[PDB]
């Protein structure tokens, strides 16, 4: 019920929440960090480190970073940014 398709309303906030994780975990150097998502999202940022599987479409995570960072970078004009794929957007 509710919606047979995925509304931009829900995906919006969904991304934003994930982005909070991504922007923090990307630059977080605090080892003592023990929040909810940063720890996990850290390994996500750390996943993209050696990703070559993404170019074959095998990265749903890099798909996410792309997904969120594109949105995040929609309001970015900086050449340096916290999350990984934001600077990837700027490579175009």
């Amino acid at each position: 019920g509710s919606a047979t398709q995925s509304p931009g309303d829900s995906r919006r906030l969904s991304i934003q929440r994930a982005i909070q994780s991504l922007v923090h975990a990307a630059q977080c150097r605090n080892a003592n960090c023990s929040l909810p998502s940063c720890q996990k999202m850290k390994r996500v940022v750390q996943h993209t480190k050696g990703c070559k599987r993404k170019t074959n479409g095998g990265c749903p995570i890099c798909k996410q970073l792309i997904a969120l960072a594109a949105y995040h970078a929609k309001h970015c004009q900086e050449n340096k940014c916290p999350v990984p794929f934001c600077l990837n957007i700027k490579q175009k």
């Binding site: 019920g1 509710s2 047979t4 995925s6 919006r12 969904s14 749903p60 995570i61 798909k63 997904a67």
Partner: protein, 34 residues
């Protein structure tokens, strides 16, 4: 150059709509168990 380049179809804006529909629904796998 040809100024028509500033009045073309933006791949980036079409992308937005697509991302607003399925940003990465592959991880979601959302099902409605009705």
């Amino acid at each position: 150059g040809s100024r028509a380049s500033c009045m073309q179809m933006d791949d980036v804006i079409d992308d937005i709509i697509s991302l607003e529909s399925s940003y990465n629904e592959e991880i979601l796998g959302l099902m409605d168990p009705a």
